[PDB]
């Protein structure tokens, strides 16, 4: 039962989408209502990976048990030292450190392609405690609360900001973009 | 003393004229090279064809300053969440436009149905006038994503601030707006 982290790889999207399914159906962490399908998921990650962001499994007996990736928050260019991680675990992998893990390697990554800040933009941050909580063991510092930003399964949801200082934050002017 | 009507594609090349000054002057716009004109016209077109409220404020056959609403994000749950922006023209700061605006703002917001209109102040340290002007229409501060851009020479904070509308998240919604 021991998890490995690796890259993405199209075969993981049928999993990946699985997951993302039961978050859609059953959490408050993601503002969508409707599952999307595998399609759909698939043209997402070959997007993300197009404009060369880091997309991540976690795979413990061959079972993808989670994933992370990360993107834009804002693509207008000043914006380019700012990046975006999303996490979801499958429902019978949660409570076993499989997050810590993901957004480590992902911190990493980031961090290896000259990221400033890392933005957590969690859903439902009050009933959300699993992901505030992970993102607080990182490092991640709260950087704002957006009230009644969703509403969703009959309640109304505040988004949590958390933000994390990678390459020297805003301490050292930048050198060239990400990803240029 | 300026008048609020909606914008109307004619007003396409003054909004490009005072767009293209905030991005080669300012740090409220994280944008670095101006759009063209019809790169405005495109972006203008979508938030209409999407329902959203844009305004200008007018005095003397001359638009003075706009602003409009959109969404934050795009996912179904966000969809009572509005976002504000306005920029004005260069000669007519200090006289009192964006509140006029923001006020009317407001206003068509809210008949719209909407529960919280957010603001995203690019570069907040420096940008004071525009803080002022969401704290003096009673927004409230909601974050700040430190170092969030870099432009000008400069490292530039995002300050968020908000304001409920129709009841906030004190009672149940109806259908989304723009449905």
């Given amino acids: 039962h021991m998890p490995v982290i690796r890259d993405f790889q199209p075969a993981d999207i049928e999993t990946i989408t699985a997951i993302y399914t039961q978050a859609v159906l059953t959490g408050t962490g993601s503002y969508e209502i409707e599952p999307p399908t595998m399609d759909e998921m698939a043209k997402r990650f070959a997007a993300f990976a197009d404009q060369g962001f880091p997309i991540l499994v976690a795979e413990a007996d061959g079972r993808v048990l989670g994933y992370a990736y990360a993107s834009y928050f804002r693509v207008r260019p000043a914006y380019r030292w700012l990046a975006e991680d999303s996490i979801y675990i499958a429902p019978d992998a949660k409570g076993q450190g499989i997050g810590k893990l993901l957004?480590?390697?992902?911190?990493?990554?980031?961090?290896?392609?000259?990221?400033?800040?890392?933005l957590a933009v969690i859903g439902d941050g009050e009933h959300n405690i699993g992901s505030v909580k992970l993102h607080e063991s990182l490092g991640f510092t709260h950087c704002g609360r957006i009230e009644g930003s969703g509403f969703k399964h009959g309640r109304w949801l505040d988004t949590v900001l958390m933000q994390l200082p990678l390459n020297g934050g805003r301490s050292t002017e930048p050198g060239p973009s990400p990803l240029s």
């Fill in 103 to 118: 957004l480590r390697e992902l911190i990493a990554r980031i961090s290896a392609l000259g990221f400033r800040q890392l």
